[PDB]
Write a protein that binds this ligand. Sequence first.
Ligand SMILES: [Mg+2]
Ligand SMILES: [Zn+2]
Length: 164
Amino acid sequence: AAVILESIFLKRSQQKKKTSPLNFKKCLFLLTVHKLSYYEYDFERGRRGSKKGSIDVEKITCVETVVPEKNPPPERQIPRRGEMEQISIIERFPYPFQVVYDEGPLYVFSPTEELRKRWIHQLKNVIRYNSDLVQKYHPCFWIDGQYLCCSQTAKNAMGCQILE
Ligand SMILES: [Mg+2]
Ligand SMILES: [Zn+2]
């Protein structure tokens, strides 16, 4: 299928336990009408590496922004307001979004506001006719065994905030 979008993002690793330290890894993300997939990026050869994951688009229930971390490390700090900077676009990833599906949320960090907007728009387009789209979501991260937004301790808990 034709690639709609291809980007390098920071993906948050699946937090195994409420005590497991959070890991963030750079991945190459591809979107088609059928799948959202992510790979290791082979920087030396300038191409995608091994596949790390794949989400069938029909399984996605929600795609929205996430409230950013309160005290992020410099790699994820939102810059002040004010052409593409080659280094910052592959080193700094301040803008998170979430992809909710059967196997909970996937958290992805974009280097720019515009790129995050592009992905959210295209994902909303490809999921438009899905059968299990939710009318509610969690605006905050699932962190250390609970949602920051509502303190619910189940990853599959119904969203606490109605989508406008
Ligand atoms: Mg290429
Ligand atoms: Zn919540």
